Write a protein that binds this ligand. Structure first.
Ligand SMILES: CC(C)(COP(=O)(O)OP(=O)(O)OC[C@@H]1O[C@@H](n2cnc3c(N)ncnc32)[C@H](O)[C@@H]1O)[C@H](O)C(=O)NCCC(=O)NCCS
Ligand SMILES: Nc1ncnc2c1ncn2[C@@H]1O[C@H](COP(=O)(O)OP(=O)(O)O)[C@@H](O)[C@H]1O
Length: 179
């Protein structure tokens, strides 16, 4: 399993998904959506969540991300408790995909550095964009940005403050460098 791993990080609404879609569609990347892997992990730790945050994190007998987000994004203390529970398992799961996968692998994660995933990467792209731009694009951003102050530019910075065609040109220039 010969492969190259490129991390794609950046704050919410900056353009990670969009960059990753381009890498997938034009360059053949296998995209590891670290958010989705989080969702799968949540289901695996239902009992511990209930132990941490009460039955309300649930809808019926069921983990509900809207209710959980309501809790964890009101407090750094709460968010840390969740991160301590799910990050180790998500890391293990990322590593496992990397090991089983050949070719170009893209690790899409806002929290690339916080989770130590950047150390799995051969190169890192950080997507950046102005606050005003982020707020026009994503409605959770006002609330979640407050918990992303440690997501600072690393590796190759790709500014996404104009058009999609312009973003496509920049992604192509980066791939010319590293691929
Ligand atoms: C509170 C949860 C349930 C909210 O889930 P929800 O489906 O509403 O959104 P989802 O997490 O899929 O994605 C939007 C996200 O908001 C932001 N976000 C998610 N987790 C975090 C976090 N721990 N800190 C800061 N921002 C976060 C990110 O930019 C991310 O793209 C959260 O996603 C969660 O399951 N635990 C956080 C685990 C984690 O660190 N996930 C992100 C990995 S990059
Ligand atoms: N250059 C752009 N122009 C207009 N809209 C954009 C641009 N880049 C991204 N978007 C839009 O902004 C939203 C957030 O993009 P996304 O790529 O999901 O950010 P992230 O994945 O970093 O959280 C998406 O709905 C996308 O369609």
């Amino acid at each position: 399993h010969h492969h190259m791993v490129i991390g794609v990080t950046g704050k919410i609404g900056t353009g990670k998904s969009t960059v990753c879609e381009i890498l997938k569609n034009k360059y053949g990347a296998h995209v590891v959506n670290v958010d989705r892997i989080g969702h799968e992990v949540l289901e695996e730790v239902k009992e511990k969540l209930v132990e941490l945050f009460g039955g309300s994190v649930l809808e019926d007998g069921k983990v509900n991300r809207k209710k959980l987000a309501g809790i964890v994004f009101e407090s750094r203390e709460n968010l840390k408790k969740l991160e301590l529970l799910v990050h180790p398992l998500m890391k293990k799961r990322v590593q496992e995909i990397i090991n089983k996968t050949s070719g170009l692998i893209v690790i899409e994660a806002a929290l690339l550095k916080r989770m130590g995933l950047d150390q799995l990467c051969d190169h890192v792209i950080t997507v950046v964009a102005s606050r005003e731009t982020i707020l026009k694009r994503n409605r959770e951003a006002d609330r979640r940005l407050k918990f992303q102050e440690d997501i600072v530019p690393q590796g190759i910075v790709v500014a996404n403050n104009s058009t999609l065609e312009d973003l496509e040109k920049k992604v192509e220039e980066v791939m010319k460098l590293v691929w």
